[PDB]
Write a protein that binds this ligand. Structure first.
Ligand SMILES: [Mg+2]
Ligand SMILES: [Mg+2]
Ligand SMILES: [Mg+2]
Ligand SMILES: [Mg+2]
Ligand SMILES: [Mg+2]
Ligand SMILES: [Mg+2]
Lengths: 6, 236, 236, 6
């Protein structure tokens, strides 16, 4: 669920 | 290469068309063809390369996770044996993902990184190298899990050292690199405290530099800072 | 065939896994392999076949429409010439779509339709034949536009005659066939009045048969009837 | 924008 660079 | 007969400009034009069509496998093939022309890539062209492969590997990672979860449940207590098919199909998707990661890493090594002299290009490509070793690490289990992890860490660290020396704290590529290195720490390297410290320090230094920016750059930087914030909220 | 060495049951199991993974190209390849084993398909297996190729061709149709619109704008008054790339790439996607449609039609002709003796299987496959000639027709422009359209019409009509004789008005496949034949009339055959009449009569006859259904079948039929209603609202 | 069988 960690967000990375879009 | 199947794209060897097509003009570089035509490949770039078609990569943009494929993006509009949400045809990302095509987009990646066009940008691979463009890279193999041997010339350096502009800022916009680097972004196209990144969008194409991110979307391709993104679909593969999402499928691998679905299948790996089914496979894990299959090996729980009380689960009925269903034969080799789940593992086989997980392995097929895994192998395809690994091949995409290898293709990207081969483009970086032949010869994007070595010709990247400016900070913006060199950092972009070293970040990319960290990212695609990180995707390899998400699925790695055997003798080379540790070496894959260290290859990701090494690439990200070299990119961070350059970004800190050469770029402002709000630079979107510097911010996206730090974001992704913090995800590496949290999700791959079993170092949640390192992840949190990096995300906090990145956010705070960017906050203090926003006053130097135009309204458009302000918007670009704060959008990425919000991802750092969202992660910190999930992680703490 | 690349699936010739895999067990039929394994191919079906993997088609279901690929659906869960949203890997529809894989799903279609697995179900093609299953069909080529030569045995008839169960109701569930027919549905898997349909979902796989519908999603594959669905992405191709969505891309072709995006590109065809760019190409049309390119040929408007005042548009700057950009060379052959838009047409080339539209043609590439178009060719790939046509190949998928041809593959499905070849499976129906070898030998799904001829072995389909029950009304539910025969109607399902004849509907499918109409559908994939309809997708061919969406992109057809030359000497065979008319023959492609008539092949779609012929398949749908044979399916309708069987469905009317052999199936209740609320049967989901009968309803989906009538829905899709009405879309054929509106979007392909330049016959909006035929489209509207078919949709209305289909809806009304199903409404009058709902009292015979269980709560679960009631839900299945009304869901499809709502699509007929939505079309009528768009069309009138 | 016409809807076909899902
Ligand atoms: Mg250089
Ligand atoms: Mg600088
Ligand atoms: Mg530090
Ligand atoms: Mg039979
Ligand atoms: Mg009957
Ligand atoms: Mg009639």
């Amino acid at each position: 669920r960690s967000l990375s660079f879009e | 290469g199947a794209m060897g007969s097509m003009e570089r400009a035509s490949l770039i034009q078609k990569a943009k068309l494929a993006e509009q069509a949400e045809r990302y496998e095509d987009m990646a093939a066009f940008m691979k063809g463009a890279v193999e022309k041997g010339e350096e890539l502009s800022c916009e062209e680097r972004n196209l390369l990144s969008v194409a492969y991110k979307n391709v590997v993104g679909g593969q990672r999402a499928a691998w996770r679905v299948l790996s979860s089914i496979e894990q449940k299959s090996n729980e207590e009380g689960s009925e044996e269903k034969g080799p098919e789940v593992r086989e199909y997980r392995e097929k998707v895994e192998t395809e993902l690994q091949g995409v990661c290898d293709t990207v890493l081969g483009l970086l090594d032949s010869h994007l990184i070595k010709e990247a002299g400016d900070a913006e290009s060199r950092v972009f490509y070293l970040k990319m190298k960290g990212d695609y070793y990180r995707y390899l690490a998400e699925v790695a289990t055997g003798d080379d899990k540790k070496r894959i992890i260290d290859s990701a860490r090494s690439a990200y660290q070299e990119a961070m050292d350059i970004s800190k020396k050469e770029m402002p704290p709000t630079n979107p590529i510097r911010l996206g690199l730090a974001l992704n290195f913090s995800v590496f720490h949290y999700e791959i390297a079993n170092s949640p405290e390192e992840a949190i410290s990096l995300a906090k320090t990145t956010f705070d230094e960017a906050m203090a530099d926003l006053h130097t920016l135009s309204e458009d750059s302000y918007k670009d930087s704060t959008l990425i800072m919000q991802l750092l914030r969202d992660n910190l909220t999930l992680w703490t």
